Amino acid sequence: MVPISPIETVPVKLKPGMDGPKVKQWPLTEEKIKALVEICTEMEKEGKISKIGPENPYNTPVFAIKKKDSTKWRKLVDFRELNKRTQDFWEVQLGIPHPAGLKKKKSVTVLDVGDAYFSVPLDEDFRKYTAFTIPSINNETPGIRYQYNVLPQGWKGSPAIFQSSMTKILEPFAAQNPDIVIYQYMDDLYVGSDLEIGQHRTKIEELRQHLLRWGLTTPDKKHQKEPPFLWMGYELHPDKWTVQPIVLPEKDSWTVNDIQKLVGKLNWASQIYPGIKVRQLSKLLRGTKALTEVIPLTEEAELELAENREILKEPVHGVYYDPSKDLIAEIQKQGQGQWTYQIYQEPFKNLKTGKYARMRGAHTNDVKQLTEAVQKITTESIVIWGKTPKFKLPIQKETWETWWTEYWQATWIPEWEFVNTPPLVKLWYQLEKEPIVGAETFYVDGAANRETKLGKAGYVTNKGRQKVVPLTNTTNQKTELQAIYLALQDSGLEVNIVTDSQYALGIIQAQPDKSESELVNQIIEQLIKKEKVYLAWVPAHKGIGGNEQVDKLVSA
Amino acid sequence: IETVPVKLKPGMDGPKVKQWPLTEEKIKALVEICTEMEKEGKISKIGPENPYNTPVFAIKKKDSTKWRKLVDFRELNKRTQDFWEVQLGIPHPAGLKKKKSVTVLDVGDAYFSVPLDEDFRKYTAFTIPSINNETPGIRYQYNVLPQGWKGSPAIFQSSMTKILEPFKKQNPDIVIYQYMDDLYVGSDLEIGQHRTKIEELRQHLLRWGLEPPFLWMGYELHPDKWTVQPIVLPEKDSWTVNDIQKLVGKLNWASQIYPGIKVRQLSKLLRGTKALTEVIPLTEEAELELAENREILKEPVHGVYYDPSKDLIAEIQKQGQGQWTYQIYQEPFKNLKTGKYARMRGAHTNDVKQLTEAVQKITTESIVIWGKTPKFKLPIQKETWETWWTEYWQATWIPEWEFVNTPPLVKLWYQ
Numbered sequence: 001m002v003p004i005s006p007i008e009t010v011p012v013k014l015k016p017g018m019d020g021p022k023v024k025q026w027p028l029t030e031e032k033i034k035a036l037v038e039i040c041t042e043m044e045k046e047g048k049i050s051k052i053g054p055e056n057p058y059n060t061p062v063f064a065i066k067k068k069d070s071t072k073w074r075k076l077v078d079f080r081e082l083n084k085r086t087q088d089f090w091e092v093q094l095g096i097p098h099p100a101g102l103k104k105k106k107s108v109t110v111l112d113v114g115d116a117y118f119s120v121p122l123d124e125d126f127r128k129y130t131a132f133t134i135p136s137i138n139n140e141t142p143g144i145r146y147q148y149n150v151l152p153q154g155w156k157g158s159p160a161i162f163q164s165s166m167t168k169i170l171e172p173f174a175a176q177n178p179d180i181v182i183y184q185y186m187d188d189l190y191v192g193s194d195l196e197i198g199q200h201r202t203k204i205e206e207l208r209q210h211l212l213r214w215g216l217t218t219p220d221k222k223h224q225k226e227p228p229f230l231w232m233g234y235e236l237h238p239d240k241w242t243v244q245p246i247v248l249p250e251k252d253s254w255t256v257n258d259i260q261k262l263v264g265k266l267n268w269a270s271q272i273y274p275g276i277k278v279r280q281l282s283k284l285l286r287g288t289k290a291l292t293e294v295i296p297l298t299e300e301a302e303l304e305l306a307e308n309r310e311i312l313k314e315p316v317h318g319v320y321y322d323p324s325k326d327l328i329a330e331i332q333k334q335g336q337g338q339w340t341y342q343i344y345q346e347p348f349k350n351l352k353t354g355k356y357a358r359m360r361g362a363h364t365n366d367v368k369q370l371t372e373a374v375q376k377i378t379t380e381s382i383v384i385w386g387k388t389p390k391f392k393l394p395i396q397k398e399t400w401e402t403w404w405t406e407y408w409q410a411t412w413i414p415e416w417e418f419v420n421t422p423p424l425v426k427l428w429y430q431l432e433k434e435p436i437v438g439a440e441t442f443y444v445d446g447a448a449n450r451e452t453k454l455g456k457a458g459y460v461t462n463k464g465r466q467k468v469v470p471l472t473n474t475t476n477q478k479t480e481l482q483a484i485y486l487a488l489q490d491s492g493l494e495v496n497i498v499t500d501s502q503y504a505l506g507i508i509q510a511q512p513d514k515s516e517s518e519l520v521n522q523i524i525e526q527l528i529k530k531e532k533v534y535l536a537w538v539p540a541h542k543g544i545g546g547n548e549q550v551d552k553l554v555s556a
Numbered sequence: 557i558e559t560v561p562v563k564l565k566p567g568m569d570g571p572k573v574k575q576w577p578l579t580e581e582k583i584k585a586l587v588e589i590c591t592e593m594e595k596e597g598k599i600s601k602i603g604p605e606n607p608y609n610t611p612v613f614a615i616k617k618k619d620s621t622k623w624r625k626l627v628d629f630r631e632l633n634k635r636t637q638d639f640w641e642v643q644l645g646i647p648h649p650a651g652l653k654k655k656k657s658v659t660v661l662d663v664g665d666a667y668f669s670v671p672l673d674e675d676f677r678k679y680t681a682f683t684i685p686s687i688n689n690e691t692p693g694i695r696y697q698y699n700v701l702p703q704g705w706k707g708s709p710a711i712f713q714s715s716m717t718k719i720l721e722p723f724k725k726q727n728p729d730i731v732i733y734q735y736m737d738d739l740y741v742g743s744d745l746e747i748g749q750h751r752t753k754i755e756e757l758r759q760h761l762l763r764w765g766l767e768p769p770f771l772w773m774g775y776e777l778h779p780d781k782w783t784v785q786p787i788v789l790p791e792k793d794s795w796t797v798n799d800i801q802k803l804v805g806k807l808n809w810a811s812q813i814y815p816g817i818k819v820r821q822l823s824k825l826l827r828g829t830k831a832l833t834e835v836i837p838l839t840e841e842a843e844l845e846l847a848e849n850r851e852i853l854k855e856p857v858h859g860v861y862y863d864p865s866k867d868l869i870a871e872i873q874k875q876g877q878g879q880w881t882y883q884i885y886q887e888p889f890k891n892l893k894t895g896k897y898a899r900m901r902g903a904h905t906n907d908v909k910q911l912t913e914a915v916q917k918i919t920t921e922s923i924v925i926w927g928k929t930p931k932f933k934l935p936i937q938k939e940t941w942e943t944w945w946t947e948y949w950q951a952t953w954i955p956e957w958e959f960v961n962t963p964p965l966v967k968l969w970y971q
């Protein structure tokens with residue numbers, strides 16, 4: 001015989017304080033027992049399990065399940081209890097490759113390594129915890145007791161230990177053959193290269209010889225799987241990729257659950273189909289989670305759905321990454337807090353697409369949202385390609401400059417250029433840094449009673465213009481905004497406004513262009529119409545002329 | 557050579573912190589660094605039975621071209637036992653902030669000479685990720701004291717004091733203070749003398765070492781010149797209504813810091829409903845009030861004291877044109893230090909680089925004055941900060957931070 005290298009075992013512990021399972025074996029029919037005994041006799045002959053004495057106090061239940069449309073039973077050892085008691089492991093498969101970061105390959109071969117899975121020994125000291133019992137016929141003898149010597153299917157640690165054992169075996173082959181890539185998924189190895197097919201098949205036989213150094217055999221009859229590959233919701237081809245078919249159902253009426261499935265499909269589609277939208281469909285899922293409830297589709301959701309069906313009418317594909325070329329990311333505003341983007345290297349050949357939705361918040365503006373979308377695309381791009389794309393953005397250089405130099409927070413967007421494709425992001429208003437000479441000064445205030453919700457808002461000016469309005473169902477905060485609105489409504493194109501409202505200043509200094517508050521929106525619409533606005537703050541209740549007078553009129 | 561036993565705090569598991577995305581250039585640099593560290597025995601590959609993780613990245617220290625591995629041990633440091641066995645602590649030297657020159661040395665490479673407790677090593681696990689997750693991340697743990705871990709200066713402290721004894725005995729007026737991987741060395745000598753003593757010091761560690769990749773570097777500080785920011789009011793011959801409003805607002809804010817501030821007579825000047833740009837003559841009563849306020853503001857704030865059991869808090873405001881103001885305090889209105897920067901280096905069109913440099917300078921000042929890092933209140937959206945700060949970081953420690961999303965009105969008063 002040829003000596004083979006053993007596969008080093010991973011030491012395994014139960015969680016601190018926990019003992020192994022001691023779970024009662026369920027009674028089985030005479031027919032199932034016979035089948036389990038034969039199944040386990042073969043598993044024992046192959047070294048996977050061993051008979052054990054009666055000292056071992058642990059147990060996990062075993063079942064027999066009829067493989068459908070067959071007279072052949074299958075065994076199921078239910079490790080749910082052992083899994084709760086087994087330590088956590090490092091999971092390598094958490095982050096999966098995105099197809100758009102892959103490289104084009106001339107050849108990809110698949111090798112089955114399912115038999116290798118059983119050459120992976122289980123830590124000797126942990127095996128006792130895997131014990132199970134086949135009941136005896138008529139319960140007239142002791143049940144047959146076995147424990148595992150290999151990684152059991154269904155045990156918490158098997159995927160991580162198997163993958164880590166195979167990676168360690170493969171590392172030297174991958175390092176000394178930088179002209180191929182190797183990727184493990186389930187019980188298959190995928191090997192890609194750009195070599196002429198003869199050298200590629202030579203590498204494959206070398207990989208087979210390498211694996212034999214651990215006694216791992218791979219089937220000679222080459223795998224049935226061949227490009228394209230169905231993998232993690234995608235279709236991988238040698239020189240392009242896409243998502244698996246996106247089929248939006250026809251339906252006369254929609255359920256909560258249906259709509260959740262629809263949004264899931266649209267979100268999956270949006271990584272290569274440009275311009276997918278889900279705002280108006282997601283709005284129907286607000287708050288409620290009664291999976292059977294029927295929701296009428298708005299007219300806006302019907303249009304969105306209709307626009308998406310058009311986008312999905314025919315297949316679209318992405319190309320793979322060429323590390324020798326720059327990555328470019330282009331972003332468009334779509335409306336209603338929705339943004340869309342394409343990442344490409346050659347014009348008209350996208351690597352991938354995507355979308356970004358406005359965060360939930362009281363007030364927002366387009367520049368902030370664009371910035372957030374840039375940071376999300378940057379982060380995704382670091383993950384997929386390890387570098388930041390160059391950005392093509394629908395905002396003028398001078399607008400950006402004005403924004404970031406005057407904004408109260410630090411902000412930054414990496415290297416970018418203006419793309420003149422409407423709608424452009426712009427600054428809708430900009431307040432003055434100094435009081436305006438010749439503009440009327442409005443001293444504004446409002447007040448409300450917390451009990452009757454009755455309030456007053458108003459202003460007085462240096463020209464003797466005055467207004468007070470009585471209000472119902474209102475609050476101190478609302479009346480303070482209402483007073484600023486009245487001053488904007490009644491002033492000319494240039495106005496100085498003096499408020500004592502720290503709340504109103506906090507909102508306006510955030511520079512919103514849209515709001516959940518219809519009052520803030522009304523104020524924004526007035527600001528857009530002005531030529532010059534200076535907003536000044538003073539402290540309340542300090543004898544400041546103008547402010548003192550209007551405070552008295554509105555708190556009466 | 558023999559390991560000090562080390563434990564986590566009671567009822568506390570190891571860190572399980574996600575690795576954030578790394579650029580291609582930082583991954584390649586870390587692969588090269590870690591291949592060498594593994595050959596030298598400092599780190600070892602680990603298996604999947606280790607579920608712990610701490611993030612790693614790579615930097616370029618100020619004024620150099622070579623990469624430096626930086627492990628973000630912030631969570632591990634929180635979870636590690638406190639080290640009071642031999643000493644309750646190293647009473648922070650109050651003379652350090654009074655020296656004319658303080659040089660900061662990266663001495664972290666010395667730590668690699670001391671093995672780490674075999675049972676604690678698992679908790680130092682980290683991952684070098686691969687681009688697009690195409691290959692399994694490379695998993696390591698430390699066999700020796702790591703850079704950035706709070707235990708390392710503590711366990712190495714007996715060896716450091718011995719290494720430095722001949723230098724201290726020969727230079728008794730020098731203040732040497734160790735914070736994490738930094739050594740701070742302060743003297744009142746002429747900088748040419750100063751630099752020579754620093755080089756003298758390096759040799760003691762080279763001699764013992766027999767190479768440290770960044771020991772040769774020197775970050776120079778002059779804390780005796782550090783400037784503060786008292787509250788100052790304008791001196792004007794013509795006051796507009798708007799000017800007086802801003803003065804009353806600033807004085808109202810100051811009255812929460814200083815008791816006897818009065819605004820009654822200044823308010824009285826605005827009696828009526830005047831245009832904001834109209835000039836108002838100060839009456840005598842208003843002028844006296846204003847002088848009395850000026851005088852109050854020249855005195856220190858009452859009841860301000862440092863408590864080493866409380867966090868230091870640092871707030872920063874962007875003032876524009878490359879200028880930043882900041883305050884360090886433990887209790888509201890009781891500032892322990894205030895200040896202002898404008899010399900933001902190579903960042904005239906990058907706010908976020910400027911803020912990152914400000915955070916580093918403030919943290920350095922905090923280490924020198926109190927011997928610990930403040931918790932920062934940063935005027936930036938979390939996502940913007942997280943995407944970019946590691947591109948500009950040059951320190952070997954990392955402070956804690958939270959985000960300010962609502963504009964503070966007080967920015968106007970620190971202008």
Ligand SMILES: Cc1cc(/C=C/C#N)cc(C)c1Nc1ccnc(Nc2ccc(C#N)cc2)n1
Pocket residue numbers: 097101102103104105108181182183185190191192227228229230231236237238239690
């Ligand atoms: C992640 C991955 C999944 C599968 C396979 C998963 C499955 N099923 C196969 C391979 C070889 C890889 N690894 C890599 C690494 C770098 N470039 C590529 N490019 C690449 C992969 C497949 C095709 C095709 N056809 C073309 C290019 N693949």
Ligand SMILES: Cc1c(CO)cnn1-c1ccc(F)cc1
Pocket residue numbers: 231232233234244245246247264265268
């Ligand atoms: C193929 C598909 C769709 C298309 O409707 C949505 N999610 N997926 C999906 C994505 C990833 C998977 F692993 C499995 C399925």
Ligand SMILES: Cc1c(CO)cnn1-c1ccc(F)cc1
Pocket residue numbers: 378379380382576577578941942943944945946
């Ligand atoms: C630096 C960091 C943290 C830690 O603050 C979290 N995420 N990131 C981050 C964010 C975006 C990136 F592109 C890379 C890393």
Ligand SMILES: [Mg+2]
Pocket residue numbers: 445446447500540551
């Ligand atoms: Mg009022």
